[PDB]
Enzyme design. Structure first.
Site, short mmCIF file in Angstrom:
data_model
loop_
_atom_site.label_atom_id
_atom_site.label_comp_id
_atom_site.label_asym_id
_atom_site.label_seq_id
_atom_site.Cartn_x
_atom_site.Cartn_y
_atom_site.Cartn_z
N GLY A 1 0.83 -1.19 0.00
CA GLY A 1 0.00 0.00 0.00
C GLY A 1 0.87 1.24 0.00
O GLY A 1 0.73 2.11 0.86
N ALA A 2 1.78 1.31 -0.95
CA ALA A 2 2.84 2.32 -0.93
C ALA A 2 2.43 3.66 -1.52
O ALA A 2 3.25 4.59 -1.51
CB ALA A 2 4.07 1.79 -1.68
N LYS B 1 -0.60 4.24 -11.00
CA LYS B 1 -0.09 4.85 -9.78
C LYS B 1 1.40 4.62 -9.62
O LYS B 1 2.11 5.50 -9.13
CB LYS B 1 -0.87 4.31 -8.58
CG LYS B 1 -2.33 4.77 -8.60
CD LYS B 1 -3.26 3.89 -7.77
CE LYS B 1 -4.46 4.71 -7.26
NZ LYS B 1 -5.56 3.86 -6.74
N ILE C 1 -5.75 -6.29 -2.15
CA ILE C 1 -5.15 -7.12 -1.10
C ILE C 1 -6.13 -8.17 -0.58
O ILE C 1 -5.70 -9.16 0.03
CB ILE C 1 -4.62 -6.27 0.07
CG1 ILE C 1 -5.76 -5.55 0.80
CG2 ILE C 1 -3.53 -5.30 -0.41
CD1 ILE C 1 -5.24 -4.53 1.89
N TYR D 1 -14.62 0.52 10.68
CA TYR D 1 -13.21 0.71 10.36
C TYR D 1 -12.33 0.30 11.54
O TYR D 1 -11.32 -0.39 11.36
CB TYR D 1 -12.90 2.16 9.98
CG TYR D 1 -11.40 2.43 10.07
CD1 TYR D 1 -10.54 2.02 9.05
CD2 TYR D 1 -10.85 3.09 11.17
CE1 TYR D 1 -9.17 2.24 9.13
CE2 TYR D 1 -9.46 3.32 11.26
CZ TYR D 1 -8.64 2.88 10.23
OH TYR D 1 -7.28 3.08 10.27
N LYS E 1 -9.43 -2.82 11.74
CA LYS E 1 -8.09 -2.71 12.31
C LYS E 1 -7.88 -3.75 13.40
O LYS E 1 -6.86 -4.46 13.42
CB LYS E 1 -7.90 -1.29 12.86
CG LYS E 1 -7.77 -0.18 11.81
CD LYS E 1 -7.00 -0.65 10.59
CE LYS E 1 -5.51 -0.48 10.88
NZ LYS E 1 -4.59 -0.72 9.73
N1 LIG Z 1 -4.39 8.16 8.79
C1 LIG Z 1 -4.57 7.69 10.15
O1 LIG Z 1 -4.99 8.44 10.98
C2 LIG Z 1 -4.24 6.25 10.54
C3 LIG Z 1 -4.29 5.90 11.86
C4 LIG Z 1 -4.00 4.62 12.25
C5 LIG Z 1 -3.66 3.68 11.28
N2 LIG Z 1 -3.62 4.02 9.96
C6 LIG Z 1 -3.28 2.97 9.00
O2 LIG Z 1 -2.09 3.44 8.04
C7 LIG Z 1 -2.23 2.79 6.89
C8 LIG Z 1 -2.34 3.83 5.75
O3 LIG Z 1 -3.36 4.74 6.07
P1 LIG Z 1 -3.42 6.21 5.34
O4 LIG Z 1 -3.97 7.24 6.30
O5 LIG Z 1 -2.07 6.59 4.76
O6 LIG Z 1 -4.59 6.03 4.22
P2 LIG Z 1 -4.42 6.11 2.61
O7 LIG Z 1 -3.79 7.41 2.19
O8 LIG Z 1 -5.83 5.95 2.09
O9 LIG Z 1 -3.45 4.85 2.18
C9 LIG Z 1 -4.02 3.56 2.18
C10 LIG Z 1 -3.10 2.65 1.31
O10 LIG Z 1 -3.52 1.39 1.34
C11 LIG Z 1 -4.01 1.01 -0.13
N3 LIG Z 1 -5.18 0.19 0.06
C12 LIG Z 1 -6.22 0.30 0.89
N4 LIG Z 1 -7.03 -0.73 0.67
C13 LIG Z 1 -6.49 -1.48 -0.31
C14 LIG Z 1 -6.92 -2.64 -0.92
N5 LIG Z 1 -8.15 -3.35 -0.62
N6 LIG Z 1 -6.19 -3.21 -1.87
C15 LIG Z 1 -5.01 -2.64 -2.24
N7 LIG Z 1 -4.59 -1.49 -1.65
C16 LIG Z 1 -5.33 -0.92 -0.68
C17 LIG Z 1 -4.32 2.19 -0.63
O11 LIG Z 1 -4.24 2.18 -2.11
P3 LIG Z 1 -5.43 2.87 -3.01
O12 LIG Z 1 -5.45 4.32 -2.68
O13 LIG Z 1 -5.01 2.63 -4.44
O14 LIG Z 1 -6.77 2.24 -2.71
C18 LIG Z 1 -3.21 3.13 -0.13
O15 LIG Z 1 -2.04 2.92 -0.80
C19 LIG Z 1 -3.52 1.96 7.00
O16 LIG Z 1 -3.21 0.67 7.36
C20 LIG Z 1 -4.26 2.69 8.14
O17 LIG Z 1 -5.33 1.80 8.66
C21 LIG Z 1 -3.90 5.29 9.58
#
Ligand SMILES: NC(=O)c1ccc[n+]([C@@H]2O[C@H](COP(=O)([O-])OP(=O)(O)OC[C@H]3O[C@@H](n4cnc5c(N)ncnc54)[C@H](OP(=O)(O)O)[C@@H]3O)[C@@H](O)[C@H]2O)c1
Length: 342
Positions: free
Chosen positions: A7-8, A36, A57, A164, A168
């Site tokens: 998920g880069a 992307k 995924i 959500y 997690k």
């Molecule tokens: N932002 C926060 O406050 C927060 C807090 C705690 C934990 N996290 C965790 O940090 C990680 C990234 O979060 P983020 O805030 O950076 O959100 P984000 O900008 O939406 O990034 C999510 C990444 O995961 C990919 N992804 C999600 N679902 C996918 C799927 N079914 N198949 C393939 N790729 C998928 C997304 O790709 P696409 O865009 O192409 O779908 C994207 O690259 C997640 O695990 C999140 O739960 C975030």
């Protein structure tokens, strides 16, 4: 010595990739499409960086092809792919299944194709798998690194946010279950990172778009809201700076004392109004172009909700976290500078 990060293309992961490249790691990211990947390769312009395509995924054995191609060279895995989508309308399909199955797929691919090669896995869990969502405002609840969100599959779908948070929680449970059940067969040690609401600038200025990733869109939406918008001044949640989160993920596979740890990343309580107050305090020249200042917030009355005992995490990580005001400042400056306003 290569690092795989799932998920880069996301907000947090692009900072993690920046940190990995600062430290001269060979990095393989997974993204949903060649589209992307192309755009990302241009942004970083670094020959140590490559991408493999994992469109979904949740799908069958989604990570097998990567370790068929790269099994020998991947020593560290950062499993960051999970959906953060508070607009989801199909809560099982859009949130819970990808979270759980993405984790199972990644761990099973390692077990099948690189059980003695991958040394460390750092998984992005969340503060959401530790906290109780309906008790964020409860000062009698103390959270620490051993606390688990008690949500069950029965009550997980109360609303999109509990769903959500359950995604997690259930994904993380499967990871520790896998680690306990395969401790003899697979070499890697697991570390989980638990950020609260993540704020901070986008890794690239060009990624300041009309709508940001969910958590930074909280800030972005408030910054562009009409002056007379109603802004909540009651405790909302905890925050952590994205740059702290990224730094922590990389330390996660480097430091032996992070093995088998849940790392709880919080650095302050906040209301929507506390965010807006930074707008007005730090860009007074623009007052009136966003909601007004109001110092009557829960935070300023000594109201911060559930208590965060992350002393162990902070001691293990050793570096000092970024304070709220700077984290909001830098997020807002990036947006307004992009817009030509400061
Ligand atoms: N932002 C926060 O406050 C927060 C807090 C705690 C934990 N996290 C965790 O940090 C990680 C990234 O979060 P983020 O805030 O950076 O959100 P984000 O900008 O939406 O990034 C999510 C990444 O995961 C990919 N992804 C999600 N679902 C996918 C799927 N079914 N198949 C393939 N790729 C998928 C997304 O790709 P696409 O865009 O192409 O779908 C994207 O690259 C997640 O695990 C999140 O739960 C975030």
């Amino acid at each position: 010595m290569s690092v795989l990060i799932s998920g880069a293309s996301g907000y947090i992961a692009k900072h993690i990739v920046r940190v990995l490249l600062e430290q001269n790691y060979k990095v393989i990211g997974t993204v949903r499409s060649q589209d992307k990947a192309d755009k990302l390769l241009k942004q970083y312009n670094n020959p140590n960086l490559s991408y493999e395509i994992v469109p979904e995924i949740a799908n069958l054995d989604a990570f097998d092809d990567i370790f068929k191609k790269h099994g020998k060279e991947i020593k560290y895995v950062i499993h960051a792919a999970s959906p953060v989508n508070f607009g989801a309308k199909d809560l099982e399909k859009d949130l819970v299944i990808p979270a759980i199955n993405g984790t199972k797929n990644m761990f099973e691919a390692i077990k099948k194709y690189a059980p003695d090669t991958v040394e460390r896995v750092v998984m992005t869990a969340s503060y959401a798998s530790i906290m109780t969502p309906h008790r964020q405002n409860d000062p009698t609840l103390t959270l620490d690194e051993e606390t688990w969100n008690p949500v069950t599959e029965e009550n997980a779908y109360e609303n999109v946010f509990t769903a959500y948070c359950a995604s997690k929680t259930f994904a993380e449970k499967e990871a520790w279950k896998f680690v306990k059940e395969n401790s003899d067969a697979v070499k890697f040690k697991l570390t989980t990172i638990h950020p609260s609401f993540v704020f901070g600038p986008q890794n690239f200025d060009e990624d300041v778009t009309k709508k940001l990733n969910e958590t930074c869109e909280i800030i972005n939406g408030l910054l562009h809201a009409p002056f007379d918008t109603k802004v909540e001044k009651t405790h909302f949640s905890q925050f952590i700076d994205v740059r702290d989160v990224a730094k922590t993920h990389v330390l996660g596979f480097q430091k032996d004392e992070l093995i088998n740890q849940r790392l709880l990343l919080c650095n302050g309580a906040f209301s929507q109004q506390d965010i807006v107050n930074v707008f007005n305090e730090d860009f007074p020249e623009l007052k009136g172009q966003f909601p007004p200042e109001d110092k009557d917030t829960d935070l300023n009355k000594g109201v911060t909700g559930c208590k965060i005992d992350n002393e162990k995490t902070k001691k293990l990580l050793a570096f000092e976290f970024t304070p709220f005001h700077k984290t909001i400042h830098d997020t807002v400056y990036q947006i307004l500078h992009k817009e030509g306003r400061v």
